[PDB]
């Protein structure tokens, strides 16, 4: 790898539909605090809401669908 990626803390703005085979995960529109202009979509697993901060280990991936 030879890459120590810095961790990113990001805050959600809205909750999209629940993807997955059995609906275990959901899609959110999440935005960063260090740059409050960049907004990406992520697939998050677990009970989420509007306002919780997610710890992203990488910030350069875009959300895949259920398959």
Partner 1 sequence: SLGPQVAEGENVFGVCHIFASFNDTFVHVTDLSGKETICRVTGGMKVKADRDESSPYAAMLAAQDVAQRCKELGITALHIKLRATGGNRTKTPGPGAQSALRALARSGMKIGRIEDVTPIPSDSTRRKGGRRGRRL
Partner 2 sequence: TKKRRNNGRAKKGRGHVQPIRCTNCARCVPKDKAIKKFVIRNIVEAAAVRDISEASVFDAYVLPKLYVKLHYCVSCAIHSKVVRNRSREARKDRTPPPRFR
Partner RNA sequence: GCGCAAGACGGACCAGAGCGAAAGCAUUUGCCAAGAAUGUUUUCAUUAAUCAAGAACGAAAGUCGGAGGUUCGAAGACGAUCAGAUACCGUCGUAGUUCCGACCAUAAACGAUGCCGACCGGCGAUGCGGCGGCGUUAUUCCCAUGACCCGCCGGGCAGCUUCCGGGAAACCAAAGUCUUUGGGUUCCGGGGGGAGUAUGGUUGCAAAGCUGAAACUUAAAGGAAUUUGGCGAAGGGCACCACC
What radius of gyration do the chain's Cα atoms show?
Answer: 12
How many Cβ atoms from other residues are within 10 Å of residue 30's Cβ?
Answer: 24
| 11 Cβ neighbours under 8 A, 6+ residues apart | 30, 31, 32, 33, 51, 52, 53, 54
Q: Which of residues 45-64 bind partner 1 (CB under 8 A)?
A: 60-62, 64
Q: Applying CB under 8 A, does 66 fall inside the site for partner 1?
A: no
Q: Applying CB under 8 A, does 41 fall inside the site for partner 2?
A: yes
Contact partner, 5, from partner 2, RNA, partner 1, none, Cβ < 5-8 Å per class: none
Instruction: Rank residues 3 and 49 by Cβ distance to partner 1 and give the closer one.
Output: 3
Q: Applying CB under 8 A, does 62 fall inside the site for partner 2?
A: yes
């Amino acid at each position: 790898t030879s890459r120590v990626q810095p961790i990113k803390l990001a805050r959600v703005t809205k909750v999209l539909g629940r993807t997955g085979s059995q609906g275990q995960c959901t899609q959110v529109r999440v935005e960063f605090m260090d740059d409050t202009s960049r907004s990406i979509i992520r697939n998050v697993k677990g009970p989420v809401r509007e306002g919780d901060v997610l710890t992203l280990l990488e910030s350069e991936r875009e959300a895949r669908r259920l398959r």
